[PDB]
Design a protein around this nucleic acid. Structure first.
Lengths: 32, 128, 144, 60, 95, 51
RNA sequence: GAUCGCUAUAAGAUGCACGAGAGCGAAAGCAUUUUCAACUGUGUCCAUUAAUCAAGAACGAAAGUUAGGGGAUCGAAGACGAUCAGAUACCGUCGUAGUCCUAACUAUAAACGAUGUCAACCAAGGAUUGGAUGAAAACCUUGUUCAGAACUUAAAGAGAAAUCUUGAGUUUAUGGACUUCAGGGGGAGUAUGGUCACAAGGCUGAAACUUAAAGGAAUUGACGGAAGGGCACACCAGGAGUGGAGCCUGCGGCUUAAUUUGACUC
């Protein structure tokens, strides 16, 4: 986006909204 | 003749002619049918409102004589594959009939729209 | 006098027919005249000396531009509808949701009709289909 | 057997060139509005005479 | 080059749309390229609507309305004054 | 044609349909076709005849 | 005994309204109800199996060919009737091939988004189709996110400009990978050669010669038997008339030694 944000460290709220493969470290959304 | 009775009127007025056709309720047996071109002496004046106005007036006279004091109007235009809009004399006929002290019952549109149509005259490029 | 040979007959009596008595005659009468009320004005009935048909005005006055036309066969037609809180312009049902409607659109009708209108009931009963898609206008347009 | 009429308003001029007035008469006999095509000078106040009020000369 | 961005028609993701017949000249025109107008008109015009009510055998009869959808082509859509030629920067108006 | 209603009529089409769609190619095949018919096959034209 | 009105019968074709800058399909295309492709979900499996592709092959609108069935509507050829100076055309009426199904051919289109296929980055905003995840208790309102057809703005980037932004941007600051095509305009997609097709024709396909332009986007003007808005004795309602008669005068023509000459729609 035009409004640049810090991406080396992401916010905890913004990580949970991104696609599971588009995070800084892709992690599954499944439990158990 | 008879006492007061209810009939129907099938006014078929296209861009070239005007039919004023009144039967009984069953629609099988007619009473009088006066056409727009019945009362004119020019082929271009068959669709004029005056030609249809005069035709409607004489239909009421014969309908009065038989005691048909009311009519169910079923108004139609040549809407098979061609223009669905009734011609100029279609509305004039209905006004003239009701002006002759004729009780006017149901008014319905019986222009047959094509559920599924066949080819239409003109070709691809239409009437140039 | 070409009409001197005609003797009028009769058929609530809702009208008279002229003959020359022969009478596969078919007569159409508006339901409002038959039931002496103006609430059933958008209907027609046919009798043979037969059937019913939705009037042309009411058939064309219930078709909306931005809905889904659901029709089955006793012919029945219904339309999807908007909502009080709905915002989007288009309210269309999927092909699978229509089959759920059609699996009860006439199936409900054939259930009671075979077991056994002019009041309300079955036309409005089949609208509650509502559990699968909102529906407002349901009519039985023609019976053969 | 001639029925007069009273003009109420003027709707403009028609008939190719300007020689025909479309006015909206009313019949004082029974207060029945009629729209007629008129030739000549007309104002709202003036009245008119018609030998046929049965034709509504709307001109489509 | 391109006088219009959508080439006059209104199809984007489909390669074919069934033809329809123009209501005036009967010219085969595509479904989207056609000019669609929906007409609502009472069978009895306003100059005669009150004439029926003076002599009507019924009591509370409401006159119905005619429901016809007209499709025109460009050749007689413009000629019929349904649509007109618009300015270059006024062409984008879509309301 | 108008017929009385008591006439009998077997329902269906007759078998062996589409027989003539095959082109008789030779003279011999056309000669063997008249094996169980009259005697009219080799037909000499009127204009190839004496007066 | 037409047109018109009610009721019945059979086949042919069609699939309105719902029908949308909506959906599916590699393209062609797909519209009455009662085998395959894709997206999403996925702490399932293999491990480079991948992209583009000469040769080669499938599908390929409409018309067209061959043989059957069908042949209702429309209708190349054709026949009349109009219009015109002529009309062999537009307008009206009739009508063979065809339009429909089957089987086998043909393989061309403005087969168009005139924009090859795959891949990375890419400003702001509304709205739509199909899923997944929360609140609001199948449908409706709202949040996050993946795929899809599109749209609005741009003072930015590109371009010769129109315009493009889900590129026609990241290009003289020139190189991500691959295939095809083009070299001024005619001759000309013509001839010859080869090959395919029952045929019409398709695919490959030059030269001799000729010529200073052909062409692309926008500006002004003019023009429109294009539209919108106004105006004029331009016209409508009229008056006077001219044109008709004799005569004055000017012009052309004839005549003559000369019949002097400029001007020729407003």
């Amino acid at each position: 986006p035009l409004i640049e944000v810090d991406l080396l460290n992401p916010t905890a709220a913004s990580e949970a909204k991104a696609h599971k493969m588009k995070r800084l470290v892709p992690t599954p959304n499944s439990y158990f | 003749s008879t006492k007061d009775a209810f009939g129907v009127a099938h006014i078929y007025a296209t861009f070239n002619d005007t039919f004023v056709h009144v039967t009984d309720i069953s629609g099988k047996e007619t009473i009088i049918r006066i056409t727009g071109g019945m009362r004119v002496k020019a082929d271009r004046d068959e669709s004029s409102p005056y030609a249809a106005m005069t035709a409607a007036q004489d239909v009421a006279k014969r309908c009065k004589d038989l005691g048909v004091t009311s009519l169910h109007i079923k108004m139609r235009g040549e809407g098979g594959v061609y223009s669905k809009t009734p011609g100029p004399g279609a509305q004039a006929a209905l006004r003239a009939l009701a002006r002759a002290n004729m009780k006017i019952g149901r008014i319905e549109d019986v222009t047959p729209i094509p559920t599924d149509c066949t080819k239409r005259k003109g070709g691809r490029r239409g009437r140039r | 006098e070409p009409f001197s040979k005609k003797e009028w007959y009769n058929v609530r009596t809702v009208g008279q027919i002229v003959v020359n008595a022969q009478l596969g005659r078919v007569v159409e009468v508006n339901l409002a005249d038959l039931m002496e009320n103006e609430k059933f004005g958008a209907y027609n009935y046919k009798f043979k000396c037969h059937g019913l048909k939705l009037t042309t005005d009411k058939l064309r006055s219930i078709v909306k531009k931005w809905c889904t036309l659901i029709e089955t066969s006793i012919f029945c037609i219904g339309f999807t509808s908007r909502k009080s809180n709905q915002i989007k312009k288009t309210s269309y049902a999927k092909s699978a949701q229509i089959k759920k409607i059609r699996k009860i659109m006439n199936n409900l009708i054939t259930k009671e009709a075979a077991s056994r209108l002019r009041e309300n009931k079955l036309p409005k009963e089949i609208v509650a289909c509502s559990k699968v898609f909102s529906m407002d206008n349901v009519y039985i347009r023609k019976v053969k | 057997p001639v029925i007069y009429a009273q003009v109420t308003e003027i709707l403009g001029r028609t008939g190719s060139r300007g020689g025909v007035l479309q006015v909206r008469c009313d019949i004082m006999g029974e207060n029945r509005q009629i729209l007629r095509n008129v030739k000549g000078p007309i104002r709202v106040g003036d009245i008119l005479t018609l030998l046929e009020a049965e034709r509504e000369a709307r001109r489509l | 080059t391109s006088k219009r961005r959508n080439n006059g028609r209104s199809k984007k993701g489909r390669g074919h749309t069934q033809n329809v017949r123009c209501s005036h000249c009967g010219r085969c025109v595509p479904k989207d390229k056609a000019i669609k107008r929906y007409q609502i008109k009472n069978i009895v015009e306003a100059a005669a609507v009150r004439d029926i009510s003076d002599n009507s055998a019924l009591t509370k009869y409401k006159l119905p309305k005619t429901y016809m959808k007209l499709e025109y082509c460009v050749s007689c859509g413009i000629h019929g004054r349904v649509v007109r030629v618009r300015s270059r920067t006024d062409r984008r108006n879509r309301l | 044609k108008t017929l009385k209603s008591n006439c009998r009529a077997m329902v269906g089409i007759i078998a062996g349909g589409g027989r003539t769609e095959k082109p008789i190619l030779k003279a011999g095949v056309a000669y063997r076709m008249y094996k169980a018919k009259r005697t009219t096959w080799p037909r000499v034209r009127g204009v190839a005849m004496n007066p």
